[PDB]
Copies of this chain bind each other. A is one copy, B any other.
Protein backbone atom coordinates (compact mmCIF):
# COMPACT_ATOMS: atom_id res chain seq x y z
CA UNK A 1 0.00 0.00 0.00
CA UNK A 2 1.99 2.96 1.34
CA UNK A 3 3.79 1.77 4.50
CA UNK A 4 5.50 -1.20 2.81
CA UNK A 5 7.54 1.15 0.62
CA UNK A 6 8.10 3.37 3.66
CA UNK A 7 10.09 0.64 5.38
CA UNK A 8 11.80 -0.15 2.07
CA UNK A 9 13.28 3.34 2.39
CA UNK A 10 14.85 2.39 5.74
CA UNK A 11 16.43 -0.69 4.13
CA UNK A 12 17.71 1.41 1.21
CA UNK A 13 19.12 4.44 3.03
CA UNK A 14 21.18 2.06 5.19
CA UNK A 15 22.49 0.06 2.25
CA UNK A 16 26.18 0.12 3.22
CA UNK A 17 25.66 -1.78 6.49
CA UNK A 18 23.65 -4.68 5.03
CA UNK A 19 26.32 -5.34 2.41
CA UNK A 20 29.01 -5.54 5.07
CA UNK A 21 26.82 -7.67 7.34
CA UNK A 22 26.10 -10.11 4.51
CA UNK A 23 29.81 -10.22 3.71
CA UNK A 24 30.66 -11.22 7.28
CA UNK A 25 27.87 -13.80 7.37
CA UNK A 26 29.24 -15.46 4.24
CA UNK A 27 32.86 -15.55 5.44
CA UNK A 28 31.83 -17.20 8.73
CA UNK A 29 29.79 -19.97 7.11
CA UNK A 30 32.37 -20.61 4.40
CA UNK A 31 35.15 -21.10 6.96
CA UNK A 32 33.16 -23.84 8.70
CA UNK A 33 32.93 -25.66 5.37
CA UNK A 34 36.73 -25.76 5.12
CA UNK A 35 37.88 -26.57 8.66
CA UNK A 36 35.41 -29.46 9.00
CA UNK A 37 35.27 -31.11 5.57
CA UNK A 38 38.62 -30.36 3.91
CA UNK A 39 41.19 -29.53 6.60
CA UNK A 40 42.95 -32.45 8.28
CA UNK A 41 46.42 -31.74 9.55
CA UNK A 42 49.25 -34.19 8.87
CA UNK A 43 51.83 -34.76 11.55
CA UNK A 44 54.97 -34.32 9.50
CA UNK A 45 57.54 -31.62 8.84
CA UNK A 46 55.04 -30.11 6.37
CA UNK A 47 52.76 -28.69 9.07
CA UNK A 48 54.24 -25.20 8.75
CA UNK A 49 53.44 -25.05 5.03
CA UNK A 50 50.06 -26.81 5.15
CA UNK A 51 48.37 -24.75 7.84
CA UNK A 52 49.79 -21.47 6.55
CA UNK A 53 48.28 -21.97 3.08
CA UNK A 54 44.73 -22.45 4.38
CA UNK A 55 45.20 -19.16 6.28
CA UNK A 56 46.63 -16.88 3.59
CA UNK A 57 45.70 -18.32 0.18
CA UNK A 58 41.91 -17.77 0.49
CA UNK A 59 42.85 -14.19 1.45
CA UNK A 60 44.89 -13.66 -1.71
CA UNK A 61 41.96 -14.79 -3.85
CA UNK A 62 39.50 -12.49 -2.06
CA UNK A 63 41.86 -9.57 -2.67
CA UNK A 64 42.14 -10.17 -6.42
CA UNK A 65 38.38 -10.72 -6.61
CA UNK A 66 38.02 -7.25 -5.09
CA UNK A 67 39.92 -5.59 -7.93
CA UNK A 68 37.63 -7.19 -10.52
CA UNK A 69 34.35 -6.05 -8.94
CA UNK A 70 35.49 -2.48 -8.26
CA UNK A 71 33.88 -0.21 -10.85
CA UNK A 72 36.27 2.72 -10.40
CA UNK A 73 39.40 0.66 -10.98
CA UNK A 74 38.36 0.36 -14.63
CA UNK A 75 37.38 4.00 -15.06
CA UNK A 76 40.87 5.06 -14.05
CA UNK A 77 42.85 2.60 -16.14
CA UNK A 78 40.98 2.17 -19.45
CA UNK A 79 42.83 3.83 -22.31
CA UNK A 80 45.79 4.68 -20.09
CA UNK A 81 48.63 4.00 -22.55
CA UNK A 82 47.11 6.26 -25.22
CA UNK A 83 47.88 9.41 -23.23
CA UNK A 84 49.13 8.91 -19.65
CA UNK A 85 48.98 12.64 -18.82
CA UNK A 86 45.21 12.48 -18.28
CA UNK A 87 45.82 10.32 -15.19
CA UNK A 88 48.91 12.28 -14.00
CA UNK A 89 47.66 15.86 -14.50
CA UNK A 90 50.00 18.81 -14.22
CA UNK A 91 48.04 20.74 -11.59
CA UNK A 92 47.39 17.97 -9.04
CA UNK A 93 49.98 15.23 -9.55
CA UNK A 94 49.16 13.41 -6.29
CA UNK A 95 45.50 12.54 -6.88
CA UNK A 96 46.59 9.39 -8.75
CA UNK A 97 47.92 7.95 -5.49
CA UNK A 98 44.85 9.15 -3.61
CA UNK A 99 42.44 7.27 -5.88
CA UNK A 100 44.71 4.20 -6.11
CA UNK A 101 44.74 4.09 -2.31
CA UNK A 102 40.94 4.11 -2.29
CA UNK A 103 40.67 0.92 -4.36
CA UNK A 104 43.34 -0.80 -2.23
CA UNK A 105 41.77 -0.03 1.15
CA UNK A 106 38.27 -0.89 -0.08
CA UNK A 107 39.35 -4.34 -1.28
CA UNK A 108 41.37 -5.13 1.86
CA UNK A 109 38.14 -5.56 3.83
CA UNK A 110 37.27 -9.10 2.68
CA UNK A 111 40.81 -10.46 3.38
CA UNK A 112 40.77 -9.01 6.91
CA UNK A 113 37.38 -10.59 7.60
CA UNK A 114 38.84 -13.94 6.51
CA UNK A 115 41.90 -13.93 8.79
CA UNK A 116 39.79 -12.89 11.78
CA UNK A 117 37.32 -15.77 11.54
CA UNK A 118 40.08 -18.23 10.63
CA UNK A 119 42.09 -17.36 13.74
CA UNK A 120 39.05 -17.27 16.06
CA UNK A 121 38.31 -20.89 15.09
CA UNK A 122 41.83 -21.84 15.99
CA UNK A 123 42.47 -24.95 13.90
CA UNK A 124 44.67 -23.40 11.19
CA UNK A 125 47.02 -21.83 13.72
CA UNK A 126 47.33 -24.99 15.82
CA UNK A 127 48.49 -27.02 12.81
CA UNK A 128 50.89 -24.30 11.64
CA UNK A 129 52.46 -23.34 14.99
CA UNK A 130 53.10 -26.95 16.09
CA UNK A 131 55.68 -27.52 13.39
CA UNK A 132 57.70 -24.46 14.36
CA UNK A 133 61.41 -25.51 14.64
CA UNK A 134 62.67 -22.36 16.33
CA UNK A 135 64.91 -21.64 19.32
CA UNK A 136 62.69 -18.88 20.61
CA UNK A 137 58.86 -19.14 20.36
CA UNK A 138 59.12 -22.80 21.50
CA UNK A 139 59.94 -22.38 25.19
CA UNK A 140 56.79 -20.26 25.47
CA UNK A 141 54.72 -23.27 24.38
CA UNK A 142 56.77 -25.98 26.10
CA UNK A 143 57.45 -24.56 29.57
CA UNK A 144 56.43 -27.06 32.25
CA UNK A 145 56.33 -30.17 30.07
CA UNK A 146 58.61 -33.24 29.70
CA UNK A 147 61.66 -33.31 27.44
CA UNK A 148 59.75 -34.77 24.45
CA UNK A 149 58.00 -31.45 23.80
CA UNK A 150 61.06 -30.23 21.91
CA UNK A 151 61.08 -33.12 19.41
CA UNK A 152 57.52 -34.52 19.20
CA UNK A 153 55.41 -31.36 19.28
CA UNK A 154 54.21 -31.61 15.67
CA UNK A 155 52.15 -34.74 16.45
CA UNK A 156 49.99 -33.10 19.14
CA UNK A 157 47.21 -32.33 16.63
CA UNK A 158 46.62 -35.87 15.34
CA UNK A 159 47.04 -37.36 18.78
CA UNK A 160 49.28 -40.43 19.11
CA UNK A 161 52.17 -38.82 20.97
CA UNK A 162 53.43 -40.83 23.94
CA UNK A 163 53.59 -38.12 26.59
CA UNK A 164 50.69 -38.90 29.01
CA UNK A 165 47.56 -37.51 27.28
CA UNK A 166 46.54 -35.11 30.06
CA UNK A 167 49.58 -33.21 28.81
CA UNK A 168 48.47 -33.62 25.20
CA UNK A 169 45.15 -31.96 25.97
CA UNK A 170 46.56 -28.89 27.69
CA UNK A 171 49.08 -28.45 24.90
CA UNK A 172 46.26 -28.33 22.38
CA UNK A 173 44.44 -25.81 24.59
CA UNK A 174 47.41 -23.48 24.93
CA UNK A 175 47.73 -23.22 21.13
CA UNK A 176 44.00 -22.93 20.50
CA UNK A 177 43.99 -19.90 22.83
CA UNK A 178 46.95 -18.00 21.40
CA UNK A 179 45.12 -17.82 18.09
CA UNK A 180 41.93 -16.45 19.61
CA UNK A 181 43.96 -13.66 21.21
CA UNK A 182 45.58 -12.79 17.87
CA UNK A 183 42.14 -13.08 16.30
CA UNK A 184 40.86 -10.25 18.49
CA UNK A 185 43.95 -8.07 18.13
CA UNK A 186 43.25 -7.95 14.38
CA UNK A 187 39.58 -6.94 14.63
CA UNK A 188 40.40 -4.31 17.24
CA UNK A 189 43.16 -2.60 15.26
CA UNK A 190 41.59 -2.83 11.80
CA UNK A 191 38.48 -1.16 13.21
CA UNK A 192 40.59 1.64 14.68
CA UNK A 193 42.68 2.15 11.53
CA UNK A 194 39.54 2.14 9.38
CA UNK A 195 37.95 4.93 11.43
CA UNK A 196 41.11 7.04 11.53
CA UNK A 197 41.52 7.24 7.76
CA UNK A 198 37.83 7.89 7.10
CA UNK A 199 37.77 10.64 9.74
CA UNK A 200 40.89 12.16 8.19
CA UNK A 201 39.48 12.09 4.66
CA UNK A 202 36.37 13.98 5.77
CA UNK A 203 38.26 16.47 7.95
CA UNK A 204 40.31 17.52 4.90
CA UNK A 205 37.42 17.67 2.45
CA UNK A 206 37.04 20.69 0.20
CA UNK A 207 33.29 21.14 0.77
CA UNK A 208 31.08 21.17 3.85
CA UNK A 209 28.45 18.59 4.77
CA UNK A 210 25.54 20.13 2.89
CA UNK A 211 27.42 20.59 -0.39
CA UNK A 212 28.78 17.05 -0.16
CA UNK A 213 25.23 15.74 0.04
CA UNK A 214 24.24 17.43 -3.23
CA UNK A 215 27.41 16.16 -4.91
CA UNK A 216 26.49 12.56 -4.05
CA UNK A 217 22.93 12.94 -5.34
CA UNK A 218 24.20 14.40 -8.61
CA UNK A 219 26.71 11.62 -9.25
CA UNK A 220 24.09 8.91 -8.77
CA UNK A 221 21.67 10.54 -11.20
CA UNK A 222 24.27 11.22 -13.84
CA UNK A 223 24.73 7.46 -14.11
CA UNK A 224 21.03 6.83 -14.65
CA UNK A 225 20.75 9.46 -17.38
CA UNK A 226 23.93 8.31 -19.10
CA UNK A 227 22.60 4.76 -19.37
CA UNK A 228 19.40 6.14 -20.94
CA UNK A 229 21.11 8.44 -23.44
CA UNK A 230 23.53 5.71 -24.53
CA UNK A 231 20.54 3.43 -25.15
CA UNK A 232 18.56 6.12 -26.98
CA UNK A 233 21.39 6.98 -29.38
CA UNK A 234 22.14 3.30 -30.06
CA UNK A 235 18.65 2.34 -31.18
CA UNK A 236 18.67 5.33 -33.52
CA UNK A 237 22.04 4.41 -35.04
CA UNK A 238 21.42 0.71 -35.61
CA UNK A 239 18.08 1.44 -37.29
CA UNK A 240 19.88 3.75 -39.71
CA UNK A 241 22.58 1.18 -40.50
CA UNK A 242 20.29 -1.76 -41.27
CA UNK A 243 17.96 0.13 -43.59
CA UNK A 244 20.84 1.45 -45.68
CA UNK A 245 22.32 -2.05 -45.98
CA UNK A 246 19.27 -3.95 -47.24
CA UNK A 247 17.92 -1.16 -49.47
CA UNK A 248 21.33 -0.19 -50.95
CA UNK A 249 20.89 3.49 -50.11
CA UNK A 250 23.18 6.23 -48.80
CA UNK A 251 22.66 7.34 -45.18
CA UNK A 252 22.03 10.70 -43.59
CA UNK A 253 24.93 11.88 -41.41
CA UNK A 254 24.84 11.05 -37.70
CA UNK A 255 25.93 13.79 -35.26
CA UNK A 256 28.15 12.22 -32.58
CA UNK A 257 30.83 13.91 -30.43
CA UNK A 258 34.40 13.96 -31.68
CA UNK A 259 37.19 11.78 -30.33
CA UNK A 260 38.84 14.79 -28.68
CA UNK A 261 35.68 15.42 -26.63
CA UNK A 262 35.19 11.76 -25.74
CA UNK A 263 38.66 11.79 -24.17
CA UNK A 264 38.26 15.04 -22.24
CA UNK A 265 35.07 13.88 -20.49
CA UNK A 266 36.83 10.76 -19.16
CA UNK A 267 39.50 12.43 -17.04
CA UNK A 268 39.93 12.53 -13.26
CA UNK A 269 37.85 15.02 -11.28
CA UNK A 270 39.08 17.28 -8.48
CA UNK A 271 36.96 19.94 -6.80
CA UNK A 272 37.77 23.64 -7.05
CA UNK A 273 35.95 26.07 -4.78
CA UNK A 274 36.31 28.92 -7.30
CA UNK A 275 34.44 27.26 -10.19
CA UNK A 276 32.23 24.68 -8.49
CA UNK A 277 31.82 21.70 -10.81
CA UNK A 278 30.37 18.39 -9.67
CA UNK A 279 31.69 16.16 -12.48
CA UNK A 280 34.22 16.25 -15.27
CA UNK A 281 31.34 16.23 -17.74
CA UNK A 282 30.04 19.38 -16.06
CA UNK A 283 33.45 20.96 -16.59
CA UNK A 284 33.73 20.27 -20.33
CA UNK A 285 30.20 21.61 -20.93
CA UNK A 286 30.55 24.86 -18.97
CA UNK A 287 34.02 25.57 -20.36
CA UNK A 288 33.43 25.18 -24.10
Q: Is A96 an interface residue (CB 8 A)?
A: no
Name the one of B42, B75, B80, B160 contacting A166, with C-beta atoms under 8 angstroms.
B160
Task: Give the shortest distance, in Å, between A63 (CB) and chain B (any CB).
Answer: 9
CA distance A208 to B265 in the complex (A): 9
Name the one of B192, B205, B229, B248 contacting A79, with C-beta atoms under 8 angstroms.
B205
Q: Are A246 and B238 in contact (CB-based, < 8 A)? A: no
Residue of B with least CB distance to A249: B285
Within 8 A of B (CB), among A236-264: 237-242, 244-248, 250-251, 255-257, 259, 261-263
Within 8 A of B (CB), among A174-188: 174, 176-178, 180-181, 184, 187-188
CA distance A250 to B285 in the complex (A): 7
Tell me how many residues of A have a C-beta within 8 Å of chain B: 109
Q: Are A75 and B209 in contact (CB-based, < 8 A)? A: yes
Q: Are A64 and B218 in contact (CB-based, < 8 A)? A: no
Q: Is A134 an interface residue (CB 8 A)?
A: no
CA distance A226 to B241 in the complex (A): 10
Q: Is A5 an interface residue (CB 8 A)?
A: yes
Task: Give the shortest distance, in Å, between A229 (CB) and chain B (any CB).
Answer: 5
Q: Is A269 an interface residue (CB 8 A)?
A: no
Which residues of B have CB within 8 Å of A46?
174, 177-178, 181
Which residues of B have CB within 8 Å of A68?
195, 198
Q: Are B49 and A210 in contact (CB-based, < 8 A)? A: no
Task: Give the shortest distance, in Å, between A200 (CB) and chain B (any CB).
Answer: 9
Task: Give the shortest distance, in Å, between A237 (CB) and chain B (any CB).
Answer: 6
A–B pairs, 28, beta carbons within 8 Å? A3-B5, A42-B174, A46-B181, A50-B177, A50-B180, A53-B180, A53-B181, A61-B191, A65-B191, A68-B195, A77-B199, A78-B208, A78-B212, A80-B203, A81-B204, A160-B166, A160-B170, A211-B263, A214-B233, A218-B237, A221-B235, A225-B238, A225-B242, A229-B246, A245-B281, A247-B255, A248-B255, A251-B286
Residue of B with least CB distance to A166: B160
| Shortest beta-carbon contacts, A-B, top 3 | A208-B266, A79-B208, A78-B209
Q: Is A135 an interface residue (CB 8 A)?
A: no
Task: Give the shortest distance, in Å, between A67 (CB) and chain B (any CB).
Answer: 6
Q: Take A173-B40, A206-B82 as given contacts and tell me if A238 and B265 are in contact as well, using a CB distance cutoff of 8 Å.
A: no
Which residues of B have CB within 8 Å of A36?
none
CA distance A181 to B46 in the complex (A): 10
Q: Is A100 an interface residue (CB 8 A)?
A: no
Q: Are B263 and A238 in contact (CB-based, < 8 A)? A: no
Within 8 A of B (CB), among A36-75: 38, 40-44, 46, 49-50, 53-54, 57, 60-61, 64-65, 67-69, 74-75
